[PDB]
């Protein structure tokens, strides 16, 4: 948990929105492609069984990175067609 607390409190407080809506393939494949995930993380959230639970994971291992890894998630949202969730985030984004 090296980001900073505003940031964790904003993504925690919008857990179950993002949770719902997302679909990891998409933004994981944005976030190593732009170098902030690797691909040790994304094979552990592929593994799950069902969307929310692949979703749940990869917000699960987000909370555990640094800020330029919650960027990197943010700006995966708003090029993979996740304007709404990004709004959401945006206050909170180092
Ligand atoms: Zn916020
Ligand atoms: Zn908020
Ligand atoms: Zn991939
Ligand atoms: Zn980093
Ligand atoms: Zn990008
Ligand atoms: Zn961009």
Do not use: W
């Amino acid at each position: 948990g090296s980001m900073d607390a505003k940031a964790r409190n904003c993504l925690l407080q919008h857990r179950e929105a993002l949770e719902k809506d997302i679909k990891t393939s998409y933004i994981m494949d944005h976030m190593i492609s732009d170098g902030f995930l690797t691909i040790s993380e994304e094979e552990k959230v592929r593994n799950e069984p069902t969307q929310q639970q692949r979703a749940a994971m990869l917000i699960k291992m987000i909370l555990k990175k640094d800020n330029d890894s919650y960027v990197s998630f943010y700006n995966a949202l708003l090029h993979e067609g996740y304007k709404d969730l990004a709004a959401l985030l945006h206050d909170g984004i180092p």
